[PDB]
Amino acid sequence: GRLIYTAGGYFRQSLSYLEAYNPSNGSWLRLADLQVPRSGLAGCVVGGLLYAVGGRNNSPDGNTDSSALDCYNPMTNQWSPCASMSVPRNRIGVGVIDGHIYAVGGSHGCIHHSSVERYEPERDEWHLVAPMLTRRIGVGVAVLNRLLYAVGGFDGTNRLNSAECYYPERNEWRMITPMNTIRSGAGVCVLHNCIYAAGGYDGQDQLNSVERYDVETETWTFVAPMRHHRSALGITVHQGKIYVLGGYDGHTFLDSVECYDPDSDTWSEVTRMTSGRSGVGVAVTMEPC
Numbered sequence: 001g002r003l004i005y006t007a008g009g010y011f012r013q014s015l016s017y018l019e020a021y022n023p024s025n026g027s028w029l030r031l032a033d034l035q036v037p038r039s040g041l042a043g044c045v046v047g048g049l050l051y052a053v054g055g056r057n058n059s060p061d062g063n064t065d066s067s068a069l070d071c072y073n074p075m076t077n078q079w080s081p082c083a084s085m086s087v088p089r090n091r092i093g094v095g096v097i098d099g100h101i102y103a104v105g106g107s108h109g110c111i112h113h114s115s116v117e118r119y120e121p122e123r124d125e126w127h128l129v130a131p132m133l134t135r136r137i138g139v140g141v142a143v144l145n146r147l148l149y150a151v152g153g154f155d156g157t158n159r160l161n162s163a164e165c166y167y168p169e170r171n172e173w174r175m176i177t178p179m180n181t182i183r184s185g186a187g188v189c190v191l192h193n194c195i196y197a198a199g200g201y202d203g204q205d206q207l208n209s210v211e212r213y214d215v216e217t218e219t220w221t222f223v224a225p226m227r228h229h230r231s232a233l234g235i236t237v238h239q240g241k242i243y244v245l246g247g248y249d250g251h252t253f254l255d256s257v258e259c260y261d262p263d264s265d266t267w268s269e270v271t272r273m274t275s276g277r278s279g280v281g282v283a284v285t286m287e288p289c
């Protein structure tokens with residue numbers, strides 16, 4: 001089976017948890033803690049390693065933004081440090097193209113990054129690429145058809161409905177059609193030919209709305225809203241279904257996990273995380289050991 005891994009997050013302070021959910025049987029496993037607690041990080045998978053990227057350690061003893069890339073091997077249930085990024089990136093978004101990891105945006109203190117860098121596992125090296133046209137933290141990132149999309153976020157002044165696309169062979173960013181909704185800290189992922197943006201914060205409210213961008217039509221369309229309003233949710237795709245994990249609804253750090261069936265256009269509660277949290281990193285890979 002493949003599992004949905006949730007790494008880090010926030011409740012009262014930044015968390016070190018790594019836990020893995022099995023959609024086939026409803027079970028959660030607690031696995032090895034992150035070496036450093038972090039919220040506002042991103043997860044991704046390349047070649048059966050799980051990567052935790054960026055974030056911030058919000059702790060009683062200080063707040064430290066992370067430039068870390070940490071490598072988890074499910075076969076050994078151990079974390080190893082991999083090469084650090086050029087800069088700390090809190091409230092980061094990540095995407096994988098052709099075995100390479102793109103780290104997009106995020107903050108370092110009051111610095112809101114437009115910069116983007118790319119990691120090569122074979123060399124354990126990061127290299128900067130062209131920066132986005134817009135500074136974005138709490139940025140949603142997805143990959144469709146080997147193109148990288150940066151969606152919404154916060155530019156240091158305004159939360160954003162704008163989005164843009166990176167063309168690797170041109171090393172160039174271009175704006176796409178903006179969303180219908182301003183969203184910072186949305187969950188962004190890809191399913192079929194569409195980029196989904198679920199939830200987020202608009203500077204006033206946490207959102208339950210969900211909309212999707214069809215690369216062929218260049219339009220955003222709303223689908224059914226989630227059962228819960230959520231900002232700083234985790235999101236992933238497992239077998240043609242979107243799963244959203246946790247986040248903040250204006251009142252509670254949610255343990256709710258919901259999944260979306262695109263054929264019925266419905267959201268269903270699927271499970272609860274072992275404890276409520278937001279700002280997690282999420283990805284899917286093989287079950288450990």
Ligand SMILES: COc1cc([C@@H](CC(=O)O)c2ccc(C)c(CN(C)S(=O)(=O)c3ccccc3)c2)cc2nnn(C)c12
Pocket residue numbers: 009010039040041058091137138139153154159184185186201203206231232248277278279280
């Ligand atoms: C300033 O108020 C908020 C800003 C954000 C945005 C940033 C912005 O638009 O300014 C944002 C986006 C992405 C992440 C991962 C986070 C951090 N996370 C919530 S977190 O879970 O990592 C976290 C939790 C509490 C304290 C620190 C960390 C924030 C979302 C909010 N939703 N409600 N409000 C009241 C929000």
Ligand SMILES: [Cl-]
Pocket residue numbers: 040056090
């Ligand atoms: Cl933060």
